[PDB]
């Protein structure tokens, strides 16, 4: 059913499935406890958001698991980067949890990369309809190598992304150039995720059983 959508109903489906913006409840132990507790509550909503991504439900349960395990930190980062957009120099983890680069000490390497990505989304003026498409691509792409249905849905999100830029009035050159600029950002989100995974493995091994389960993979 994911293949039969018009790019308009593909956009309306992703925006309707958008997860909420949760709240949090500065030593190195207290700040870590707040972020991991916030990320654990966000994992539950992302799981229900993933099932509402068209084409994800049609997959094997084991394939649903592998895609979510490979990209859960990427999804959390592009969401943070998106929420933190109109807050330059700041990362909006939660509406009550706004941290600066100085608080990054107690991480600061990944913190500046997240600030650099948010500044890039503002420079390009990334729209929300493009953001939910990029977030869906991350879900299906980052784990498809460890499939013929996945790439057919990936091509559709590409058709949906090109349609969004065509409606805004960009020439064909401006469309595939902006298309390339958006997808090349996903290589940096992948890079930030892997650099975050290796810190959590070192820093942790009190975290939840669910979040620990995501790391043992």
């Amino acid at each position: 059913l994911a293949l039969s959508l018009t790019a308009d109903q593909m956009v309306s489906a992703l925006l309707d499935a958008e997860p909420p913006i949760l709240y949090s409840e500065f030593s190195e132990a207290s700040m870590m406890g707040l972020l991991t507790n916030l990320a654990d509550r966000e994992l539950v909503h992302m799981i229900n958001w993933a099932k509402r991504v068209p084409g994800f439900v049609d997959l094997t349960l084991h394939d649903q698991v592998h895609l979510l395990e490979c990209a859960w930190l990427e999804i959390l980062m592009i969401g943070l980067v998106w929420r933190s957009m109109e807050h330059p120099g700041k990362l909006l983890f939660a509406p009550n949890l706004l941290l600066d680069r100085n608080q990054g000490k107690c991480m600061v390497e990944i913190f500046d990369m997240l600030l650099a990505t948010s500044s890039r989304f503002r420079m390009m003026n990334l729209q929300g309809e493009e953001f939910v498409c990029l977030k869906s691509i991350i879900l299906l792409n980052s784990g498809v190598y460890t499939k013929d249905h996945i790439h057919r849905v990936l091509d559709k999100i590409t058709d949906t992304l090109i349609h969004l830029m065509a409606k805004a009035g960009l020439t064909l050159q401006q469309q595939h150039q902006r298309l390339a600029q958006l997808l090349l950002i996903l290589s940096h989100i992948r890079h930030m995720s892997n650099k975050g995974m290796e810190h959590l493995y070192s820093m942790k091994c009190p975290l939840s059983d669910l979040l620990l389960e995501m790391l043992d993979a």
Partner: peptide
């Protein structure tokens, strides 16, 4: 497998 449980509910 806790992820199995949430994907079913």
């Amino acid at each position: 497998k806790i992820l199995h449980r949430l994907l079913q509910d």
